[PDB]
Structure formats: C-alpha cells, structure tokens
Design a protein around this ligand. Sequence first.
Ligand SMILES: Cc1cccc(CC(=O)Nc2cccnc2)c1
Length: 186
Amino acid sequence: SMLDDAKARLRKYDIGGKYSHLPYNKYSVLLPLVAKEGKLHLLFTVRSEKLRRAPGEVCFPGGKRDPTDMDDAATALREAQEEVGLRPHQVEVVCCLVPCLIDTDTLITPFVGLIDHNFQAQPNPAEVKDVFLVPLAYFLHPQVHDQINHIFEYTNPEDGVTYQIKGMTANLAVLVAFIILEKKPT
Ligand SMILES: Cc1cccc(CC(=O)Nc2cccnc2)c1
C-alpha cells in the first residue's frame, strides 16, 4: 500500500539514536505526513507573529527538548501536541532523519510521523498563526523564487493563499519527498 510503501522507504534512512546523546542545545521537529485524496501531504505551521524567533515564518511543529522528554522523538510529539493539538495516539513516528547542525551549539533532530486520518488541527494561537498542508509531490517541482537564496511559493488551490517556505523547513520537505517519491511506477 501507499502508506506501507512510504514507511518502508523512510526506514532505510533512519539514523535512530546515533547522534542523540551529543552535548548540544537540542531541538526536535516533526515532519507530519497526512494522506488525503489519495496522495501524501506534509503538514506545516505558520509561527505566530508574537514569537521572538522567526515570527510569521513557515515551520514544522517542534521545539526545544525539556527534562520531561524520554528521548528526542518525545520532544517532537510534546511540542506538536502543544502547537497543533496532535495527540500521541494520532501519530506513528517512523524514523529519525539526519539531524541539522546550527549556530555551532545546536542540533535539530527531525522525525517523520504518519498522522491519523481523523486528526484535525487545533492551532494554538499563542504559537501558531496557521496550519496548512502541501502535497509531497509539490517539492519535486516547486515554484522557486530567489530572494541570494531559494524560496518556495506554494499556493493552496482551496483558497488561493500563497505561503513562502524557506531554509531548513524547505530543505527537509524536499528530502522527505525524494525519499518517498523517487523511482515509483505510475
Ligand atoms: C524547521 C524548524 C527549525 C527550528 C525549530 C523548529 C521547531 C519549532 O520551533 N516549531 C514551531 C514552533 C512554533 C510554531 N510552529 C512551529 C523547526
């Protein structure tokens, strides 16, 4: 099946806990895969305009590890619940992708999660201004604007709203799309 095929592909790229004990300032992100209308989508947030870091930017759910977290995956799931109301029974964490090093002292660990079809986002407005889906296939043929660095513009055909997706968030989206969608019979 589509979902079994995605999980099988993803597992081949799982680094697991290899980098998890290293003494960094630690953050995790959840790359949430949603199946709608027979296709996979990624779920993104738009960060509230009131956050100090990166107000109004498109981001995956996630945040800083805290002492309660059993592991880095727990961080991602805790933060996703806080930001968009995703409950743990509503997500299957399939793998841990390559971590992202930033600022010389920070390591961001991305986890891919399969999201239950009955999940409906409840954006927490103190953290998230919007939640939206993008089809995973978009990231194979994105609409690129050069601001010099590359920015994706995605327009939701449901409402005509355009989102800008940049940086680590854009990079990770492409990676997930390659992993899951490369070399597939039609
Ligand atoms: C791509 C990336 C880079 C750095 C940190 C994060 C996690 C995060 O802060 N997510 C978040 C927070 C609040 C609202 N929406 C999303 C993600």
